[PDB]
Amino acid sequence: GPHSLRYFVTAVSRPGLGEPRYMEVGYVDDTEFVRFDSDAENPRYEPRARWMEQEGPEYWERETQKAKGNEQSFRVDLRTLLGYYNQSKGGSHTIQVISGCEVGSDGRLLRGYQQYAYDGCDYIALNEDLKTWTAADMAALITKHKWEQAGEAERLRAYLEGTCVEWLRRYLKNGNATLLRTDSPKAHVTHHSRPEDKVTLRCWALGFYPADITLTWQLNGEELIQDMELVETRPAGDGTFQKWASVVVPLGKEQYYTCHVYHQGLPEPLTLRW
């Protein structure tokens, strides 16, 4: 299938409470595998999956040093942005970045990302052509004009077509046996009587992975497209995820309803019935 390597960067200023807090978090196929955080004992790049411990001391030493440079650099961006927007120098502000690539099955680049946000909102992004930028307002245009003059798009294109996909291939070789791990859900229906003369059927799916799940309730072969309570898929806090969908039914009529669970772990989708 496709694969991705993406880094989610955060710098948040704490006026008076010291230097801004800085962090980099790395994802392979949307699973955290490295993390840097300025607010640890000795801020280090850390492995976040057992299979990243196959890297030797050189790797962590390079990425830790690189992160300290990016940190110092984002401390300046925060001061720069406050000036561009001509804001008060007292409040806390945030910069976020999404940076990385998606590659098809041949291992070649499908999409590259270079997304900045200031204070939760789009600031500048690298377009899909990997040559031009989209600025979100006039402050971001100063950055655009500067980055056009620096050849920043060319520098990013080289990174995303070369360095980035090469590291992703490196990471895939070590992690593939773990990242393709699939855990099928564990389903059961619960029953909760309510006033008056109707009852809440709640269909549970537990311990599944990946979090990609679909749950439906049905009356005699029709998807009760609402209303029917759904819960945002949630981590159980151990690598697996949870989710439930509930529907309200008349008293005595429970057996006419069926719950359906769709997940890549299941050969056949689950049908459950109170």
Partner: peptide, 8 residues
Amino acid sequence: SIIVFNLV
């Protein structure tokens, strides 16, 4: 490996 970033 994350890229080294430039200044906005």
